[PDB]
């Protein structure tokens, strides 16, 4: 829902980074955890335990992302004393795509990972900043 | 600008009304007197421009390209009559169809007043050369070749028409008069720039830029020779033709934004001169040197200086003409040997001396000999890209270099030398060939006479 | 089965669709989609096999789950107001309620997975009738109600519904399957403009009804249902595989093919709201539905496959039995796009 | 969509069954028969988008 | 010879006739492009005596 | 512009009697010659179905093409203009019911109005 | 195995057929001699004699539309009415300054 | 010759010119003007368009109903 | 010639594309046509939407 939204949002950007990184890290497990149920209901494995701990890793990896992102970007932001870059993001986006690559072991997708994430997390800030609507309400 | 356009469309019924063995003289015919018809609109103004209608208008960077593209045909046609002899009568004239369907969407795209019929009509243009790639080529690889050339062109325009359309929610309309009179600088903005992308990417692809130009040497080896005449000579300056459109709305904005596109043009250009020094085949090596020449030109147009402005629109011109002449050599050497490899056939001036003097001239246009309107280009390009900044005139003059070098490379290896001997088939060249080549070429240096009327608006 | 009876369902289908278009009380919509999938089962059914059979109860676990879901969307928006009447529900508990059961009635994702294989089990004639004509009734209440959905739910399942479409037609070799995926791309398309204009929502219908008419009776006429079978049309009816690419090219959305009109209009209306990225991200997705088009394309009509020497025989005989508006509906499918400005009719 | 059959013909085909306060049997009243035709005279005519507010 | 090369030349024709179709539409089209036919600034000029518009 | 709910609509009129009070599209419409030219198609492709000599096989039948063609484009061009015609009416009426929405913008020449200048270097 | 290697019914690939075999004086247009003669005299008559002579001819001579001795005469007259007043030639604002109303600023 | 038996006089260009912008910068404000008038109505429903249907009150039976309070 | 234009310039953009798409298109449409994952699926996207939206 939009209580974590909100949550992650309301701390300002360049402070207080332990709760951005608590937020963001929430944030990735609800993720790996929607991910999880719909690879539960749509591949059923071999069992239940097998099925819980395909969710486990699968939460655990999106929690890492969100909480690597999260500290890089504030981290970057308070470091940098400047606000409102997307500079910042995509450099927490390239931290939660190399964070990803070591978790599947792989130097490719790390890399590949890290590029298209921190480009992601630029697109987001800018959009937070000009204001850009994904869902526009009906205007016209 | 009906009376060009009505013509192009009757083609059509004729064609298809024509016996079995008059197709290609009545094709020819009447497509040169389309091309006499058009060549009438290169009386142009000093003022705004020839504004026929609501729809149509006429610029004098138009008429030049549309009269480039008039002229095309009846080339392609005759380059087009040998390798379609044992081919059924239908299928002749659906060939001979996409080649009229082609020509009519680049006449209505270089007129198109509004900018929404340009970017329906320039997308148009892909189906019938899609169609004659992956129809009418020869080796397996043109399907995929055909792929290449449409994704990458759609990857560039679907943006550019949601920009388009969202400049018609906000100024209010699309139409370039319109557009240019009520123009208004952009903002350093995030918005403002992915507008300017979505508007530049599109015709950049197409030039091509020089790390987007993949899709250019598949599409043009694999194609057969009318489709290789048409992508290099006219469907190539489509994006030059909307980047000379477009950059009226994206100012000041090009200042800043120009300076990725600068850079991969200028290097770019160097390395594909350089990749034209080893090339195993001949088509490859005419759209190395294809992209190099759009790669001086995409500096021009961002310059945006009346110099750099009037060299593209001279290099445009003159590149179109030199290119196709290269292609139909290739073309006339491949129909005897069948290998377009480029070190097979060997010594071909001892056995076809007129050909020879036709590939020396074609190679003495490529490599900007003065007082070429090639060369007029160049060193318009050149001189304003040196106020720009006088360090490109390194960049600039490595590529001049290594054009001479590949150029004269190209002619050595094929025309000079010992003939191969176990190639016996080599037949004296026909009177169709030394024609087809006689009429790229004579434009060319009669053009150098009178340079006014391609070197563009600003003049 | 006897012509009879066949006749008397094809207009108990046309009835219920009927039904629910005029009728101004939800209980008698609910009563036309009863009538609908009555009258449906056994035109899946007509043709006997396992897999038809298979098909018809896939469909009619799939719709009933449906047609409840909707009741249930009648009541409590009857509970929470008095009313009866087809308009804004009032609840939105409701709303969403009747959002999942006509996107399980129209097949958009995540209800998507229906589609494909109802479409591969039942023949061709039915598949035609099932992506042509079963989704003119939830289309239409969609458009009724149209002020009460919720944006995000809605979009969040046109973008689902465009790209499952356009990743699932890239894995297929059976035609039906192709057109199922299709099918589910374009009704991602037509559901991305209901919050803003109802209008586009039918002219993109309309337009793809005509592609889809047009397709499944040129693969009627050359009888091919996988890529191979279709790869020997050139070899009897080259007339018919040209015609084809074609179709094919206006489906994919290229100008100045017929099908170029909709998703253009579409996004020009997304974009007076202020809506830039996912019009955006949704012609980047039908590059794919594009891609595998042109396979198809390729496959058929541009290059010419190997055929057998029983092919022959066939050289000696004609069709006995011609579908009349064939040739309308290639000409309405491949050239109307000059007459765009008509869709002010409010078709 | 909606094609208003009934009225261009004039049919009430199932208008009589939709609000409380349309004409019921033996003149039976509607628990809320009172509140509906308040809340439906206020809202006659002036659209959905004024009625809501 | 004549009513035998015509149905063996006929096609010739069609597009020298396309060519005067559309300089006919081109002038139709500028019939409808005189609402400031001699009211722009730099060329309002007075009729001659025999004269009906300034150009056509 | 959403016109169903507009007050005074007769539900299944094709073209509402005030209709009437618009210019007929004349027959030489560009738009009906267009109308024209599918119908000749839809018959060149119907005789290329059928394996029929695709210009010459049947006469009545491409007429009948032709003529089906140009006579529904005909409605369809009136019904066109006139739902054109109503919008442009109701935006009209709206913006003079409304003055204080579209307030008058003061006429100001460009000798007054200063625009930044951008020189290119 | 008694496979043939012969993975289907194929015709083999012709050679190549020379125009100048059945038909010296051939011109490379086609394998009928008087279709070949015609398609040569049409291309280098509408090619070489129509467009190329007449055209380039009707190039040369188009009316001065871009207006270049129009401007020069201009300038000449221009030129000798400020010499002879003594005025500067050209003056450095394009428009006049009397017209313009600039914002005071009042900083 | 040629300008007077091929061309026309600048006159008839300049005021063709005019003309096709005064039509293009009316359809310009028409359209914007246009898009003004459909948010104002979409916002308010005080207009024409964006009319929603609400319930007919000629289906109100007035009549005594068996009990004296409704 | 062969380092960065028949290499990486392929690697980047076309073949980078046409491997996402591929193993996307192969993820999306491999279910073995078992109606129970299917309707479970239907379960949690139905419960999911719900809770999201209010
Ligand atoms: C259009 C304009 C012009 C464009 C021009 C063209 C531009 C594009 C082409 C050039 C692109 C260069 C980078 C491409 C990606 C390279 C990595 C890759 O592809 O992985 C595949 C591949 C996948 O892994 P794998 O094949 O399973 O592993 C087998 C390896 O042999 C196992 O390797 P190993 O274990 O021997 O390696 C040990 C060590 C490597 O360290 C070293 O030896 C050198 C240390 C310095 O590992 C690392 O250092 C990882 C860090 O990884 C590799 O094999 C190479 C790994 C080393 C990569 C080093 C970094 C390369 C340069 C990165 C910087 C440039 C891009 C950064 C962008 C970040 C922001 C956007
Ligand atoms: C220099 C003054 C000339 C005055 C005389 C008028 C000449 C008119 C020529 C017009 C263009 C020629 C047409 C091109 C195709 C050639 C036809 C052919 O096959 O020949 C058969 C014919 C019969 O020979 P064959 O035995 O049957 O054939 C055996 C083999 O073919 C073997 O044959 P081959 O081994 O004898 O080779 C054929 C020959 C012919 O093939 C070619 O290569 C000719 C094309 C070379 C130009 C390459 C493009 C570079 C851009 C230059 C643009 C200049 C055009 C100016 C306007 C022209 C108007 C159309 O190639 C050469 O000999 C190489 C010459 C290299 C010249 C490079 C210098 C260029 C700049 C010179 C100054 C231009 C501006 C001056 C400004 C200041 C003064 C006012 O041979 C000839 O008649 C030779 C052609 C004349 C030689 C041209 C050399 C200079 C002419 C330059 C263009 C006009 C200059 C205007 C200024 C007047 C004052
Ligand atoms: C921009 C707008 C302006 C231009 C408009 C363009 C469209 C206009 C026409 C639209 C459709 C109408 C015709 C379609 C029916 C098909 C007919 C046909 O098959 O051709 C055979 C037929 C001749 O053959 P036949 O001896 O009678 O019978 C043998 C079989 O029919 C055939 O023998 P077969 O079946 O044994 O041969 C097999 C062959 C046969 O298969 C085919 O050729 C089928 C034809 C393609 C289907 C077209 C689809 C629907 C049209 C949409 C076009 C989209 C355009 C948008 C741009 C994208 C380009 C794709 O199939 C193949 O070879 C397959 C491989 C071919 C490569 C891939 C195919 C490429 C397709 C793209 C074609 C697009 C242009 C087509 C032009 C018209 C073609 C006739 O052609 C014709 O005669 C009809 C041409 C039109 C007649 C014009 C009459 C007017 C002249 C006198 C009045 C003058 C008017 C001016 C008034 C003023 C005078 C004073
Ligand atoms: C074989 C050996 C040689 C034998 C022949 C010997 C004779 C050689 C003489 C010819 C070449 C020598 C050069 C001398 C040039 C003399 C003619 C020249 O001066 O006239 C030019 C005139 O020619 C034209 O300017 C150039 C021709 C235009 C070319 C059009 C191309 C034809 C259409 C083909 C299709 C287009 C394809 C390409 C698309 C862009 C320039 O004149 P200009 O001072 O300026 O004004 C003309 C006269 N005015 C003053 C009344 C106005
Ligand atoms: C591959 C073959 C060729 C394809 C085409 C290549 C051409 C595309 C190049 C795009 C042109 C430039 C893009 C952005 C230019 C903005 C200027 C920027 O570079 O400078 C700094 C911008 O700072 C940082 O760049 C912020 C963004 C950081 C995130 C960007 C990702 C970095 C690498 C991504 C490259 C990948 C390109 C391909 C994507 C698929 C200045 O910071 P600041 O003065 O404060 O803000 C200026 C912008 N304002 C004024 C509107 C606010
Ligand atoms: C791709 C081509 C598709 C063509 C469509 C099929 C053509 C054959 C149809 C045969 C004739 C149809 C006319 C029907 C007669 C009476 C019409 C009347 O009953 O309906 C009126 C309206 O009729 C239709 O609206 C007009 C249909 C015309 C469709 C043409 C526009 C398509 C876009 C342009 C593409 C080019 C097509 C032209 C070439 C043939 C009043 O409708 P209304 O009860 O008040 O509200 C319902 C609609 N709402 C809900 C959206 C408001
Ligand atoms: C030395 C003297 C001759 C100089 C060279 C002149 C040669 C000119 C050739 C090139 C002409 C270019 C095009 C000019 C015509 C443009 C189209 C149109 O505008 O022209 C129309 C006239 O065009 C002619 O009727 C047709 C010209 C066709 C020329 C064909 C030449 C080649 C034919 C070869 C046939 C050979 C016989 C067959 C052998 C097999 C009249 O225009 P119009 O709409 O009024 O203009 C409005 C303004 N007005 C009213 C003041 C005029
Ligand atoms: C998010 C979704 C974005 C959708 C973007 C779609 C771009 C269009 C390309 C999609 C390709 C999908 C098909 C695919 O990759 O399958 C692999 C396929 C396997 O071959 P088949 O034809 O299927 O089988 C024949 C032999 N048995 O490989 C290929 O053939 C690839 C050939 C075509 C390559 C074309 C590349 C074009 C892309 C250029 C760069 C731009 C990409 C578009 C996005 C731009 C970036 C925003
Ligand atoms: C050869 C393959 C190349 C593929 C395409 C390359 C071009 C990419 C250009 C961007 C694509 C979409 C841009 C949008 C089109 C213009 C519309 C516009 O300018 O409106 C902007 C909207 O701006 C955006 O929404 C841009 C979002 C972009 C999302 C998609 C990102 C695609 C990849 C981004 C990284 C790469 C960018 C350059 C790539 C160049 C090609 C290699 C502002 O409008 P508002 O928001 O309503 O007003 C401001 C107040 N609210």
């Given at each position: 829902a939009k209580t974590l939204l909100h949550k992650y949002s309301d701390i300002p950007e360049g402070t207080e980074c332990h709760r951005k990184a608590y937020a963001s890290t929430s944030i990735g497990g609800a993720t790996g955890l929607i991910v999880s149920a719909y690879s539960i209901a749509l591949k059923p494995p071999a069992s239940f335990l097998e099925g819980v701990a395909r969710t486990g890793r699968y939460t655990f990896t999106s929690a890492a992302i969100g909480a690597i992102f999260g500290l890089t970007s504030c981290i970057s932001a308070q470091v940098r004393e400047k606000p409102d870059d997307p500079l910042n993001y995509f450099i927490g986006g390239c931290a939660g795509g190399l964070t990803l690559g070591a978790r599947t072991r792989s130097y490719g997708i790390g890399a590949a990972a890290c590029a298209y994430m921190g480009l992601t997390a630029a697109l987001v800030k800018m959009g937070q900043l000009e204001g850009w609507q994904v869902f526009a309400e009906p205007k016209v | 600008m009906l009376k060009i356009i009505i013509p192009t469309t009757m083609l059509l019924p004729m064609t298809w009304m024509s016996k079995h063995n008059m197709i290609w003289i009545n094709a020819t015919v009447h497509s040169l007197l389309i091309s006499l018809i058009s060549l009438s609109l290169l009386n142009q103004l000093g003022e705004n421009s020839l504004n026929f209608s609501l729809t149509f208008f006429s610029d004098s960077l138009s008429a030049p390209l549309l009269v480039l593209t008039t002229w095309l045909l009846p080339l392609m046609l005759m380059a087009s009559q040998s390798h379609l002899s044992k081919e059924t009568t239908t299928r002749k004239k659906?060939?001979?169809?996409?080649?009229?369907?082609?020509?009519?969407?680049?006449?209505?795209?270089?007129?198109?007043?509004?900018?929404?019929?340009?970017?329906?009509?320039?997308?148009?243009?892909?189906?019938?050369?899609?169609?004659?790639?992956?129809?009418?080529?020869?080796?397996?690889?043109?399907?995929?070749?055909?792929?290449?050339?449409?994704?990458?062109?759609?990857?560039?325009?679907?943006?550019?028409?949601?920009?388009?359309?969202?400049?018609?929610?906000?100024?209010?309309?699309?139409?370039?008069?319109?557009?240019?009179?009520?123009?208004?600088?952009?903002?350093?903005?995030?918005?403002?720039?992915?507008?300017?992308?979505?508007?530049?990417?599109?015709?950049?692809?197409?030039?091509?830029?020089?790390?987007?130009?993949?899709?250019?040497?598949?599409?043009?080896?694999?194609?057969?020779?009318?489709?290789?005449?048409?992508?290099?000579?006219?469907?190539?300056?489509?994006?030059?033709?909307?980047?000379?459109?477009?950059?009226?709305?994206?100012?000041?904005?090009?200042?800043?934004?120009?300076?990725?596109?600068?850079?991969?043009?200028?290097?770019?250009?160097?390395?594909?001169?350089?990749?034209?020094?080893?090339?195993?085949?001949?088509?490859?090596?005419?759209?190395?040197?294809?992209?190099?020449?759009?790669?001086?030109?995409?500096?021009?147009?961002?310059?945006?200086?009346?110099?750099?402005?009037?060299?593209?629109?001279?290099?445009?011109?003159?590149?179109?003409?030199?290119?196709?002449?290269?292609?139909?050599?290739?073309?006339?050497?491949?129909?005897?040997?069948?290998?377009?490899?480029?070190?097979?056939?060997?010594?071909?001036?001892?056995?076809?001396?007129?050909?020879?003097?036709?590939?020396?001239?074609?190679?003495?246009?490529?490599?900007?000999?003065?007082?070429?309107?090639?060369?007029?280009?160049?060193?318009?390009?050149?001189?304003?890209?040196?106020?720009?900044?006088?360090?490109?005139?390194?960049?600039?003059?490595?590529?001049?270099?290594?054009?001479?070098?590949?150029?004269?490379?190209?002619?050595?290896?094929?025309?000079?030398?010992?003939?191969?001997?176990?190639?016996?088939?080599?037949?004296?060249?026909?009177?169709?060939?030394?024609?087809?080549?006689?009429?790229?070429?004579?434009?060319?240096?009669?053009?150098?006479?009178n340079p006014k009327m391609i070197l563009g608006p600003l003049y | 089965?006897?012509?009879?009876?066949?006749?008397?369902?094809?207009?108990?289908?046309?009835?219920?669709?009927?039904?629910?278009?005029?009728?101004?009380?939800?209980?008698?919509?609910?009563?036309?989609?009863?009538?609908?999938?009555?009258?449906?089962?056994?035109?899946?059914?007509?043709?006997?096999?396992?897999?038809?059979?298979?098909?018809?109860?896939?469909?009619?676990?799939?719709?009933?789950?449906?047609?409840?879901?909707?009741?249930?969307?009648?009541?409590?928006?009857?509970?929470?107001?008095?009313?009866?009447?087809?308009?804004?529900?009032?609840?939105?508990?409701?709303?969403?309620?009747?959002?999942?059961?006509?996107?399980?009635?129209?097949?958009?994702?995540?209800?998507?997975?229906?589609?494909?294989?109802?479409?591969?089990?039942?023949?061709?004639?039915?598949?035609?009738?099932?992506?042509?004509?079963q989704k003119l009734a939830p289309l239409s209440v969609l458009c009724q109600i149209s002020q009460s959905i919720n944006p995000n739910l809605m979009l969040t399942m046109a973008m689902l519904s465009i790209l499952i479409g356009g990743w699932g037609g890239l894995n297929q070799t059976q035609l039906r399957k192709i057109m199922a995926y299709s099918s589910i791309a374009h009704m991602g398309w037509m559901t991305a403009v209901l919050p803003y204009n109802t209008t586009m929502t039918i002219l993109n219908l309309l337009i793809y009804i005509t592609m889809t008419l047009a397709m499944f009776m040129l693969l009627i006429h050359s009888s091919a249902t996988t890529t191979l079978s279709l790869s020997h049309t050139w070899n009897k009816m080259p007339v018919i595989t040209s015609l084809m690419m074609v179709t094919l090219l206006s489906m994919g959305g290229l100008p100045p093919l017929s099908g170029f009109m909709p998703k253009w209009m579409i996004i020009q209306e997304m974009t007076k709201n202020e809506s830039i990225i996912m019009p955006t991200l949704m012609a980047m997705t039908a590059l794919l539905n594009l891609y595998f088009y042109m396979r198809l394309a390729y496959s058929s009509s541009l290059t010419m496959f190997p055929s057998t020497n029983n092919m022959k025989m066939k050289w000696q005989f004609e069709h006995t039995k011609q579908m009349k508006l064939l040739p309308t509906m290639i000409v309405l499918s491949t050239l109307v796009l000059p007459m765009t400005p008509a869709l002010s009719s409010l078709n | 969509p909606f094609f208003d059959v009934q009225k261009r013909l004039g049919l009430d085909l199932d208008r009589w069954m939709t609000i409380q306060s349309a004409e019921q049997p033996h003149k039976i009243p509607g628990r809320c028969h009172a509140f509906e035709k308040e809340w439906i005279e206020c809202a006659h005519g002036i659209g959905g988008i004024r009625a809501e507010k | 010879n004549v009513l035998q090369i015509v149905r063996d030349h006929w096609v010739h024709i069609l597009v020298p006739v396309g060519f005067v179709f559309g300089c006919y539409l081109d002038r139709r089209s500028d019939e409808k492009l005189t609402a400031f036919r001699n009211k722009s600034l730099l060329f309002k000029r007075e009729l001659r005596p025999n004269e009906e518009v300034t150009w056509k | 512009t959403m016109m169903s709910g507009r007050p005074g609509r007769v539900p299944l009129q094709f073209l509402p009697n005030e209709a009437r009070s618009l210019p007929p599209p004349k027959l030489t419409d560009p738009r009906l010659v267009y109308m024209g030219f599918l119908g000749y198609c839809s018959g060149l492709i119907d005789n290329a179905i059928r394996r029929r000599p695709v210009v010459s096989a049947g006469l009545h039948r491409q007429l009948l093409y032709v003529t089906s063609f140009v006579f529904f484009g005909y409605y369809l061009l009136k019904r066109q203009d006139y739902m054109y015609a109503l919008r442009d009416h109701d935006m009209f009426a709206y913006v003079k019911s409304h003055p204080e929405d579209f307030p008058e913008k003061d006429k100001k020449t460009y000798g007054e109005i200063l625009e930044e200048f951008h020189p290119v270097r | 195995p008694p496979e043939p290697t012969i993975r289907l019914q194929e015709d083999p690939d012709p050679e190549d057929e020379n125009l100048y075999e059945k038909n010296p004086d051939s011109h490379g247009y086609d394998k009928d001699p008087i279709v070949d003669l015609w398609n040569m005299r049409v291309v280098f008559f509408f090619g070489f004699s129509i467009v190329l002579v007449l055209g380039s001819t009707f190039v040369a001579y188009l009316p001065d539309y871009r207006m270049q001795e129009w401007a020069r005469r201009e300038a000449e007259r221009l030129v000798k009415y400020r010499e002879a007043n003594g005025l500067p030639l050209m003056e450095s604002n394009c428009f006049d300054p009397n017209k313009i109303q600039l914002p005071e600023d009042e900083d | 010759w040629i300008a007077r038996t091929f061309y026309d006089g600048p006159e008839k260009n300049y005021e063709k010119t005019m003309a096709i912008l005064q039509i293009e910068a009316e359809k310009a404000e028409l359209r914007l003007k246009e898009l003004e008038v459909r948010r104002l109505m979409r916002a308010r429903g005080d207009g024409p368009w964006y009319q929603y249907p609400t319930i007919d009150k000629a289906l109100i039976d007035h009549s005594p109903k068996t009990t004296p309070d409704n | 010639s062969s380092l960065l234009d028949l290499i990486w310039l392929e690697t980047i953009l076309p073949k980078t594309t046409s491997f996402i798409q591929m193993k996307m298109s192969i993820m999306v449409s491999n279910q073995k046509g078992l109606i129970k994952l299917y309707f479970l699926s239907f379960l949690i996207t139905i419960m999911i939407s719900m809770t999201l939206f209010n």
């Open positions: - | 659906l060939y001979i169809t996409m080649l009229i369907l082609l020509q009519l969407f680049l006449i209505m795209t270089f007129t198109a007043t509004e900018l929404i019929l340009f970017y329906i009509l320039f997308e148009a243009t892909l189906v019938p050369t899609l169609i004659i790639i992956t129809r009418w080529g020869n080796q397996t690889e043109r399907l995929n070749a055909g792929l290449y050339f449409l994704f990458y062109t759609l990857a560039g325009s679907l943006p550019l028409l949601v920009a388009l359309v969202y400049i018609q929610n906000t100024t209010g309309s699309l139409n370039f008069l319109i557009i240019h009179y009520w123009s208004h600088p952009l903002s350093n903005s995030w918005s403002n720039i992915f507008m300017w992308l979505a508007c530049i990417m599109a015709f950049m692809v197409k030039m091509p830029l020089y790390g987007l130009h993949l899709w250019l040497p598949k599409a043009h080896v694999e194609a057969p020779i009318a489709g290789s005449m048409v992508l290099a000579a006219v469907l190539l300056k489509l994006g030059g033709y909307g980047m000379m459109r477009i950059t009226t709305i994206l100012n000041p904005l090009t200042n800043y934004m120009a300076y990725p596109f600068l850079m991969l043009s200028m290097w770019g250009m160097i390395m594909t001169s350089s990749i034209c020094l080893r090339q195993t085949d001949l088509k490859s090596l005419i759209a190395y040197s294809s992209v190099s020449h759009m790669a001086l030109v995409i500096v021009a147009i961002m310059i945006q200086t009346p110099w750099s402005f009037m060299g593209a629109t001279a290099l445009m011109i003159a590149h179109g003409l030199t290119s196709s002449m290269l292609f139909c050599l290739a073309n006339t050497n491949y129909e005897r040997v069948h290998s377009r490899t480029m070190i097979l056939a060997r010594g071909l001036q001892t056995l076809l001396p007129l050909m020879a003097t036709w590939w020396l001239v074609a190679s003495l246009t490529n490599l900007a000999l003065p007082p070429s309107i090639n060369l007029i280009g160049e060193l318009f390009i050149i001189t304003a890209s040196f106020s720009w900044s006088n360090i490109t005139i390194i960049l600039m003059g490595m590529n001049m270099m290594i054009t001479a070098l590949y150029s004269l490379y190209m002619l050595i290896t094929t025309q000079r030398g010992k003939y191969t001997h176990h190639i016996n088939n080599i037949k004296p060249s026909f009177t169709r060939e030394n024609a087809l080549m006689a009429l790229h070429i004579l434009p060319l240096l009669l053009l150098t006479l | 089965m006897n012509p009879i009876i066949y006749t008397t369902l094809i207009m108990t289908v046309m009835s219920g669709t009927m039904l629910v278009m005029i009728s101004s009380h939800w209980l008698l919509i609910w009563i036309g989609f009863e009538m609908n999938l009555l009258a449906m089962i056994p035109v899946l059914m007509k043709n006997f096999n396992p897999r038809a059979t298979e098909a018809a109860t896939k469909y009619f676990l799939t719709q009933a789950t449906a047609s409840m879901m909707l009741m249930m969307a009648i009541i409590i928006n009857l509970l929470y107001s008095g009313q009866w009447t087809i308009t804004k529900m009032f609840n939105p508990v409701a709303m969403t309620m009747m959002t999942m059961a006509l996107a399980m009635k129209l097949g958009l994702s995540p209800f998507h997975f229906w589609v494909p294989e109802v479409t591969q089990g039942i023949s061709l004639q039915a598949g035609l009738l099932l992506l042509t004509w | - | - | - | - | - | -």
